Amino acid sequence: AHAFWSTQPVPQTEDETEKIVFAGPMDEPKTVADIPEEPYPIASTFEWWTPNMEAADDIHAIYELLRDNYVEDDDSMFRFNYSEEFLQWALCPPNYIPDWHVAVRRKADKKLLAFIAGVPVTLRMGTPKYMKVKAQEKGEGEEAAKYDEPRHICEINFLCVHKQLREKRLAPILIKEATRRVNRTNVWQAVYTAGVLLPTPYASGQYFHRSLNPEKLVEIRFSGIPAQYQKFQNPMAMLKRNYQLPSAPKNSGLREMKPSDVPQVRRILMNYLDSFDVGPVFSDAEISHYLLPRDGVVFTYVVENDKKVTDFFSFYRIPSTVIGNSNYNLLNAAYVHYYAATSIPLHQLILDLLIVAHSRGFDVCNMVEILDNRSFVEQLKFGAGDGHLRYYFYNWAYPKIKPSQVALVML
Template structure:
């Protein structure tokens, strides 16, 4: 936002009765509860979400579905709604071009995620189904939001939801409340399909997260991470010596092998059993499991015992960039740790990632990841990721009660 736009925004907020603290929060989105309590949240306070100071007593759906509008909500001027076809490669390319120029969601402020066309095509073709919603004007895309149909287990209750992601507005239109229109429209579309609950994450603190997790990184190519500014060392430290701290031995576990189609059934059973320990996790069927873990975007390995799968672990691949510097990042994805410690699984995965020329593995503090963080030379990142439910109240959950990964 340039200075002229910012001054106009300040004047408008003052006229509307905002205090200086509230104006600051409007221009600098809150990242924690303390700063969020100063913000008015004119949109979110009208929505069926847990309020900032609300203590959840009874969990469950907030509003039952009644009188769902059959028509899209109105848009100003000559803007119009566009429902994209996930099977149409041109539509995917159109969305990819828009996101590559306008999507900035990432925990590290100085680095931007580089979502590739092939990655988006994989996400958009989830067999459960997806909503791809845009706002257009004169054949140009100005706003976009997606939502994958996802069956979740929330404190032992099976809940049909949409997993909302890629909310993005053209950077020149970000004070036009276009994001609220996108949220309302994807909500309406889901409601038309009898889905009333949404799941989403954000680096911003909104009303109100039921848990928040932190980013950690396990360096692999430490020298490159320092040279690109992703990691730092003391000015008096020797880079070669520091890099040795993150060296990996070349010990290969012969029972740790790349997941193949023949492993899917056993790996799926491991996944289902392992998810039972969590309070918030997806309830995938075997078709969705195979689609998510056996593809070109996710690297999945299984641990064998007498040729039978006893556990698995995976990561998905994305690059991040800053000032034309590219870092290859592996994001720790789902795993099971029934008979194999997560530390052993992760150490084997690190060796695979190194061979695949991954520079760093990024993970959050959910599932059993704290054990990895404590034992595997991980370094803390910047920022947090907050988890939200739309039209569903959930009591606060601890990190190790969560097993839901947003791509």
Template structure:
């Protein structure tokens, strides 16, 4: 299955030493909670992890995404070395504005953007980041961090720098007495607490076909495919961009709706909520729908990620713009027949987001995961199951596998 490891637990030379659930410990009677609850600040080194055992001529640095030069360096490292699709056809091209939004939410600590530089040239060759995260796992609230944007320059791969970066960020997080983390990855590591699949809804069929990320199935005409993916010109519902004035109502709705899920991101302050959900040009689109009395009935958002098209063949098309469904909530989620009314409402909301993404934001594709209640519309709205999976992990925390019921979204 998609969450099966490609090697034995013994072969995870790094991960078998870490406070994470191990493959093969299914039989243990661990209860939900920290794997090691005894570690204290006194156990944490005040010195950075030793780098020179792995590579010579490099040093740790602390990056600051509010510094434009630093942001440019992080952007360039990721742009050239971050995640590619399986056949190296496309690579993420997170914009600078996106990165800034993702790695500096309220409460971020100044030493949680960690880099490695060449001592002489000062070139940035590796990166990892942490941001604060209030998690709710079943009924427990867990103060944690989210780890993302782990990246090692292509020329420095397989030198065990990833474990060194992970140990260093763990140390820097622990200095604030935070002992749990959430992270997601396409690769299977010990041991996923949930696995979701990517689904893709073509918007600009011609362009996607040209790049080669969609294909016409045998025996089907290109016209048939194109007509299948036509996007409505007109929206079903009335929207206003989400703004501060809708905060109170939306936050209440959000909290109610999210009770449906077992793994969720909780927003404790207005500042946190607004940071995640206020629209940002070319990065985040977010809307509320209002009823006749002007009351907020739904909230929906998606973020935009550009991709670089790799390879000589596609000189004419350089980037793809992909929309990713982000958080949403609806007052339908608390009605009696909630699945049925939520399903109908989500259908309308999603169609409208396709319209906005395609006609207004010029996106080429709309992606969503099989998380939240997305199963209610994926098929009807022509989202196709993709080849990629996203595994969810918790560091130093044990919980039963969560099948369905994930609403936490990481920005990848």
């Protein structure tokens, strides 16, 4: 069972999710006035803390907590090491709410013990196309279209409890307090991803990886040398050859995105994303924030030929600590972010992403099978990884959809 999740406005089982036919809320309507004004009760030795995520020292404290306590694989080989600059970027988008960044510290020594972050997002989350068809076939179109308008909701990320405080039911308390602060802002839905199975995902997708520095990936045991390679006199030489990339981009007119590109990038991105069942809606300010290049954080390139931007891609950087190998500090990973192609095939656009990532010293390129990411898996030599990324809503009934109908990239 789920002692915490069984108390929450989420579908409880897979059989439950398969009965859902229209998008809409689970909970009864509430007002801000109904929500307790005071923070959720916590042990007298602990205190709630709202970090100022634009203050270098507060960012650093969050950085340390995550560096030492955030997502690790089951074999404790790698742990995310989100940079301070990345954290400021991720947590402070346009119109962010400082109160949605929630921490727990120990009163006695002020040691940070836990964290959860919420940021605003405008999300299309109305009934999916295939279910709208079923609704039309049943004469149920009005119900199905009720929540079509993009919604201003909360995106939750960076949930983390210190290793010393694991399995003490602190995570539920963090979630309840985050929910309270978000509710007090008159927001009633959230979206989040997890690599674990909880009640109850609306979409699940496999991870994919594209080796850029195969020798390093083998050394740190991220990858193995596949059995067939042992038929070669020099397995490693053949592995390096198979994953080799051009030393410079192949698309003429590829350049870094500039501020003047924001309107055209917004247009082509929004045109593209609107085709998916679940996707964000971005203002000029949000395009600028999430896509303009930021050193060591986000990398974005446009294709400009005949003086017009026709295509773009973006990727972001999350290095992981290489826990057990003493020869390497970090695994430098590039993550496929947003993109749009109108003039060239997607594989041709994303080949340039791999080329740029490789030339900038990235070891691997990662993605989930959302958007049209499946369309270039085979040609660009991506391989499926371990497990799945699952997408969830809080207080939103939603029918199961394919990951190829999801257009929300999570950081």
